[PDB]
Amino acid sequence: RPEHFTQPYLDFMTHNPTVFHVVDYCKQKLLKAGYVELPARDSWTGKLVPGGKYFTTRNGSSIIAFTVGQAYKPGNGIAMIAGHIDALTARLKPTSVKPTKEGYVQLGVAQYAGALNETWWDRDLSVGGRVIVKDPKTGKTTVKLVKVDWPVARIPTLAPHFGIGMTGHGNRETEMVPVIGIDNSDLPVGKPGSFASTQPPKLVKLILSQLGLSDPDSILNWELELFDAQPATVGGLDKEFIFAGRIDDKLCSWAAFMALLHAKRAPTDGVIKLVALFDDEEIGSLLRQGARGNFLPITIERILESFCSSNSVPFGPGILGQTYARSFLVSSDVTHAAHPNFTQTNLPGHSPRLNVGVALCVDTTDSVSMAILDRIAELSGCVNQRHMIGPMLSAAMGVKAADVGIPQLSMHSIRAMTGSLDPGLGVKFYKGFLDFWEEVDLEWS
Amino acid sequence: RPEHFTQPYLDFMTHNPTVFHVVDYCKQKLLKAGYVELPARDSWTGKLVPGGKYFTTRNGSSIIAFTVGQAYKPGNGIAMIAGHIDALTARLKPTSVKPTKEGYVQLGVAQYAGALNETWWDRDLSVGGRVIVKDPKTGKTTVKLVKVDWPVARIPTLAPHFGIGMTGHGNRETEMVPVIGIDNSDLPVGKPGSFASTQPPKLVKLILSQLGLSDPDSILNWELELFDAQPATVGGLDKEFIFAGRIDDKLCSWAAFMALLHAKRAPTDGVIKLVALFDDEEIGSLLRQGARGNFLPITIERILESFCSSNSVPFGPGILGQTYARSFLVSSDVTHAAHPNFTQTNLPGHSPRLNVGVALCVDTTDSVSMAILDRIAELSGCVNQRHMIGPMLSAAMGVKAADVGIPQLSMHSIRAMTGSLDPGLGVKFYKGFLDFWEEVDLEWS
Amino acid sequence: RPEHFTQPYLDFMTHNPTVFHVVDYCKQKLLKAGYVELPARDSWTGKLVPGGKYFTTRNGSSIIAFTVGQAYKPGNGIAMIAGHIDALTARLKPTSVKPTKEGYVQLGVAQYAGALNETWWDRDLSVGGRVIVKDPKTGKTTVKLVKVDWPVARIPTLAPHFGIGMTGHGNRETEMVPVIGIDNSDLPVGKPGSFASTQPPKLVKLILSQLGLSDPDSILNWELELFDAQPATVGGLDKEFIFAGRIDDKLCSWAAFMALLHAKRAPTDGVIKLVALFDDEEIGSLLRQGARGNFLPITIERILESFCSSNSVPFGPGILGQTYARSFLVSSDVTHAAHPNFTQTNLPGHSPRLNVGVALCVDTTDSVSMAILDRIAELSGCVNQRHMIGPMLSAAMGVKAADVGIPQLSMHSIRAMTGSLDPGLGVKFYKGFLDFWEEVDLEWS
Ligand SMILES: [Zn+2]
Ligand SMILES: [Zn+2]
Ligand SMILES: [Zn+2]
Ligand SMILES: [Zn+2]
Ligand SMILES: [Zn+2]
Ligand SMILES: [Zn+2]
């Protein structure tokens, strides 16, 4: 079964370039699997029920999905997995328009997370994100997703012949300005104060067509980024490899998500099985949608308070915290696979292989956490590797936790690699955790 | 009386080398003094009663102990002390086994804190920690403490004759690899995939005998570290000094703990007297057992909600926070004593002496905090010093707070020093705070 | 049998911290074994006898002991071993008193031979040496040994927090000044011209109590040093290691000494068997008690002249030198064992192992010397190693010679390392040399 996840992972990576696409992807699969959305502005305290499946969203870039076991009662524990779905990228400036320079049309961008490193030069870049549109019919402000299907942007290297490097000194504001087109005419869209006037005129027209809008003044704002247009693929002589960009945690997040969809719901399951995918981890994770934010804790408190009303039980501290005491959090970010050409950096016995299994990262993880996940791995038919050179929902909730990752090479590159079976082996371990946590917890004292 | 704590402190330091021994030490003395343990998974909302004495544990490395005044009612303040019981130490790697090299058997370790500094060379190192054992009788997973009573490990310097230093370049992964034994045979324990196989065979057998086990496959994991085998002692011509390692906060923590054990329970005490000892402050103090984690706030809320049930009072924000507004938090970490040989680093009037009293550390502390603790010091018969070059439970609970410390030389050394009266003077001040806080708070407006 | 020397070596190291204690230790064992002291101011030319046993002393820091074979006649050779019993240490200055500074009482000291090094920081240091006392009963000037049984002194590191290192710039004069006590009174013994007045007042009183003396002016002078108070011990998982300080040649000297005490006296022994232990090799060994001084040569000439009287043979050059031509000198200083973490410094084939045997050091040693001692090792049941990166009584006497050493790690550290069987393996070899030299010499031409 692990190879059964290779191409679905490939298609996921290719067609969901931005964090907004990822949540939209997860949201449509959860709805087709029968999950019910819980809007934050609505009262939940009536409507949660054992055997139910739910999800909730924040800023359309953060999502928490969970299933409540049929044997669930207030005070029972949660098996939860956390990951981040943001990736290093380059966002269009509030004013992205630039002067046409030596006949080239350029684009103002800002490196989001420190993204524009040497691997970004001479890549075919496309654009995508969300647009804030004022709907023609309703007069309500809305959000729509957009993507250009061919490369519009590029950051060109300089020839080595000039004595500098090809990358120059590497300065991102002067030398890394993307090139989006040609205008040689030396040989404008929207009312002068509008948003559209701050952006390149063909970018606006291109975006308006994809949204089926004609009036530039319908666009209040957008959030757009550049991403590598090259599809995810398998490679190697035997196709053991996956080549794709944005692997830093779209990989572990996708695996955790698929784990939840594929998890058991046994009539005897007494725990809540939960996956939390967060935005903004490469900036530290503290923002409304980040992992150091209220999002997951207040969601958990809402769920528990909801079941407390149904059972006429008082909600408070220590019904919460009897819950936390019975819970376990797997915090999953990608880890470094053994690098064959920098062996300086491979700590022996602690440097994970590709196409083997998940690595337990140690420096959150500790002897108890490792005993728990090694045991789960055995019930799952998984082998757990070790790696050493937002993990800290653990502190916010006082939940026992471990750091866990799928091995990867060239982390933070615009295009990285893992083994072709690593997504599936990931799904296999996470599913093993959600399914066996409650059983394993009862083997302790 | 301060001298009456010198040998008890000595014995404490000598026989409790790891954070797990410290909690076990506190737990046995709390139980012998009649404290009741509150397990997180159980409901407390019935049990708590004025005049009662309790404690709670997290991961066996974090502990919170408190007494409820007989005059206590919901809304009354808490007099609380926080400290950390972790110390810089070197933890065994997940795979601690190494190739025998030039006839030596070595041990894979990782500096936990940033610990392995120059003072760690040529010290007699022993090993200790916790083991995750599979009880053959019950079949339940358990935890046991272990210690080897003689030095097993050493990090040898190089002779100066070779042109390098004795310490070399100081690189921790190549040049400081402990040496645990000799094997010259060039002139194995457990099923090949088990945990025992990742460890030195001879350490595993040594650990199994200490725990009275035969089969290597009964050990699922362990958490072991290296510590200095040399006992704590008194020193100097007049025995004014205490020479011991791991003083960075085992000292302030132990004195705080003893203050609680020695505090008044007057029939007129209306506050709660609490001590919180945390793990992982040298790592920034957030994960599950850390100081910027859930542990102390959720415990306090649980206690308050419990007494709210008993008195049929609603629990919520503003019964909590009336509580916080009547509270005070002494966050106690060790401080730097005047160093006689680096006088450049001694800020005059702000550089505390040994065998005098506790230092108020200023850079949390403020004119109000100092007014209170100077006032408590006067009722206690104490003299407070000043020091200047997890404090931030204060922000999490909005509690009035100060940073307080017992002066020390050679902080973060494998072996440090303070005055022989400094533990006692510590207990004396902390006891003064817990006993007099409520009285002092009523002198204000 | 080599294990039979482990604890007696451990006890020797622990209780004889200074060169003065070493000579006193050797002296009482020689006397208990029936050796006769030869005072330098007395004529010996009557009093030496075949089968006799004798020793001689210089400054109470140097000693030469020997046995005369029963078959001895003038012109017969000597099997002699030479070593040094001084060790790197810190002497008290002539005026050790210091100003009390920031409440600390300090002690003026001087490094004896580049001794204070990185490993001397944060060690528990005690004091010992000899005292020159004025005898009240007799009025004679005399010498007494003294040792304090608990740590009186410490050289404290600075916390890393201050931006310097813990060791500072390392300057031994301002930054390494030992700390002996506390005086906070800012919050004396003897006539003002006497020796006692130049020293710390409580040091003087402490020393006087140990010698059972009341009057400070009975002390004319003393020679005192700081040494590591930590006992010698065995360590390692199976206790294959010895951890002790001052191993540089207390180890080889002690082994040589016990070899003499354990040597054969066969009725057919025709050679003198002799051990010379010298002071000050770390200073290059020229002064009265050093190895480049007259001590051993003039003692040998005295012995030879004495037996020339008894046999009415003329003494002169060429009865001496027939003697030297039949002799052999084993010059024994410790050597560097293979270091497992600096392999750059281990010369393959030439880097000796712990718990194997003595290494023959080559750079005095030569093809002839090696053939002799390899042959002696075979008769003794010993394994000789090779080592490669004052031996020069060889030049003074024109005696054939070799440099041999017991391997050791971290030479010149305040606390070094050897194998637990290495002292024993040392005495086994040295005994082999003394017993078999005459036999082996007759296998040559
Ligand atoms: Zn990252
Ligand atoms: Zn990541
Ligand atoms: Zn610290
Ligand atoms: Zn601290
Ligand atoms: Zn030396
Ligand atoms: Zn030497």
Numbering used by the authors:
A (entry chain C), B (entry chain A), C (entry chain F): 50 to 236, 246 to 421, 427 to 452, 463 to 518
From the paper:
The earliest discovered selective autophagy pathway in Saccharomyces (S.) cerevisiae is the cytoplasm‐to‐vacuole targeting (Cvt) pathway, through which hydrolytic enzymes are sequestered into double‐membrane vesicles, termed Cvt vesicles, and transported to the vacuole 8, 9. The best‐characterized cargo component of the Cvt vesicle is the vacuolar aminopeptidase I (Ape1) 16. Ape1 is synthesized in the cytosol as a 55‐kDa zymogen that includes an N‐terminal propeptide (hereafter referred to as prApe1), which oligomerizes into a dodecamer 17, 18 and further assembles into larger aggregates in a propeptide‐dependent manner 19. In addition to prApe1, Atg19 also binds another cargo hydrolase α‐mannosidase 1 (Ams1) 25, 26 via a site distinct from the prApe1 binding site, thus forming the Cvt complex.
In order to further improve the resolution of the mApe1 EM structure, we used an Ape1 homolog of 40% sequence identity from the thermophilic filamentous fungus Chaetomium (C.) thermophilum (ct‐mApe1) 30, to exploit increased stability of dodecameric species when compared with sc‐mApe1. Moreover, we determined the crystal structure of ct‐mApe1 organized in dodecamers at 2.8 Å resolution. In the crystal, ct‐mApe1 is present as dodecamers, which are formed by two asymmetric units each containing six ct‐mApe1 molecules. Cartoon representation of ct‐mApe1 structure including the catalytic domain (cyan) and the ancillary domain (magenta). The binuclear Zn2+ center bridged by the bidentate ligand Asp259 of the active site is located at the top of the catalytic domain. A conserved histidine residue (His163) belonging to the neighboring subunit protrudes into the active site. Dimerization via the ancillary domains forms the edges of the tetrahedron (left). A book page view along one of the body diagonals reveals the catalytic sites (Zn2+, yellow spheres) that are buried inside the hollow tetrahedral core (right). The amino termini (orange circles) are located on the facets of the tetrahedron. The superposition shows a close structural overlap of the dodecamer assemblies except for a noticeable difference in the active site that is well defined in our structure due to the presence of the cofactor zinc, but disordered in the sc‐mApe1 crystal.
